[PDB]
Amino acid sequence: PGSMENFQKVEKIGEGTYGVVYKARNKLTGEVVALKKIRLTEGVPSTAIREISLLKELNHPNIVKLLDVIHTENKLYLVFEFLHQDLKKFMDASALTGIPLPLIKSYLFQLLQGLAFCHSHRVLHRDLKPQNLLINTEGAIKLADFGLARAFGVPVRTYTHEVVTLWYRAPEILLGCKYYSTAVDIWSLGCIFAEMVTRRALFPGDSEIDQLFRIFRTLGTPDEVVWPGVTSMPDYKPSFPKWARQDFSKVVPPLDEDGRSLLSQMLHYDPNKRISAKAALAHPFFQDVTKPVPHL
Template sequence: MENFSRVEKIGEGTYGVVYKARDKVTGKEIALKKIKLENEPEGVPSTALREISVLRELKHPAVVRLLDVLLADTKLFLVFEFLHMDLKRLMDITKGPLQLDLVKSYLRQLLEGVAYCHAHRVLHRDLKPQNLLVDVEGHIKLADFGLARAFGIPVRAYTHEVVTLWYRAPEILLGAKFYSTAVDVWSLACIYAEMASGRTLFPGDSEIDQLFRVFRALGTPGEDVWPGARLLPDYRAAFPRWPRREARLLLPAADSGSAARPTRREPVREHVAVRAERARVGARRPAAPLPVERAPGAARPAAAAFSAFHRLRRSSRRLLISVELISLSPVNKYLYFF
């Protein structure tokens, strides 16, 4: 870890903290996700293992790049390419709809990225603005694959409590144990509507409220629209019967004059420029480097590394083996265990 200097904390998730850092050798900015393992009896959390295994396999411009995985005693560091902010933060800064041509650009990139994941038999299962990263050049990338899983034959029952509530597909809300790539597409459609309108499409505060918001907007599904919906575990015959409506009525009308305007990427660029200026003028203290913690056995001859491996605690040995297995295992085979 001595090759990186920490700049600032930029986020915190369910199993770790994310820092903006700088590679001392190349000078490039990177994102470091630190995963603490002290309270994990099995070593590394399954969500982290999923993310590592998936991102070792997926290589696409619209998928965030995992650059390295570093082990340092009771900590695991995931090294990612750095992007300036997530889509949620960008929309909060904009305080309204994004420019239509930027929405179109983002949507195309997201569709291409999700199509790539699905072609490689991976469901993301947690698409939301907080898990989409953007930069000043207009790129947007899928991130946070902690809930991702492989799909295919044999068909397996999946966990139905996935995807943040506002972006959760109706089949999951109705308790489906078997679902497909459509759950990611539903999430993308909700995100698209939010980018274009500046407001959350279905901001439910409970599962039943979320479901009724969808039914109220699109109509309560019948066999003619959704064959088999009534057979799902949580479908009730007593559901209110809202009339069917076209989905396009939920989305704002396209601005006919937007095509003549250049794509606006100023919100991200301006935000980054303001932060840089504040850092320069504010005379902040230099960022402290990350603690120097070398993974046992790093950059040593094979015999010494083997000896160092046996001096590790049992939990650390299990973690190291897990990380190495990830690098050797195809993503589909590995993820079937979760």
């Protein structure tokens, strides 16, 4: 815990709605970090306050590590451990080679681990997508960007409705559920799981209703059988086209039986039936899980 005196900026990395990110080198230790700059007239932004406090509670191999907070006059500098790129970049680069199944399995296993940890400490991420999953050169993948995250209670209250990037948003949020929970993060990982296999997003909608319909055409339009309570949800409509569920093996053709089993449980419509990160760790899909290192 020191000051920017010992940091040497190496280059800009990117940006956030609040932060500007740089790669930096600690000049005394040699440590490479990612510095998130937050400029300060309504005081410290709520997202920055959530991100810091929740992140200080989450020490885990698959959660990005907040190393320090440099709190000065007009500047708040968050110091993160440096990771080499995000999953989105990697999938793109893995265009023609494709991602080896053992590496998908590994990443998913690790992601379920970081996620179970968050949920065990009453934190929802609420913005899981490849852009926020960072990877290193040693085979690790980690959850990042806790700006949209939230400390939750047991049982949950109503929280912000406008949550999760559209492509990865769970049907209970789309339908206006007053009470979402940990299941929304699993939905997101389900979408990421399918995306790692195909390298294209699974439900690339351009609007809420488009998003719902795309989901429905894949998983079938939900009724009171498959999902009790669905038809009495605020934004549910009786006029919804009623599509058949398609054979799951057509949803992600390269996936084996175990993979399909697990994907289907992560995409269960009923939040209550949808598998928890904790339980997913013990799924047969992971029986031969290893930790391969990816390719630069």
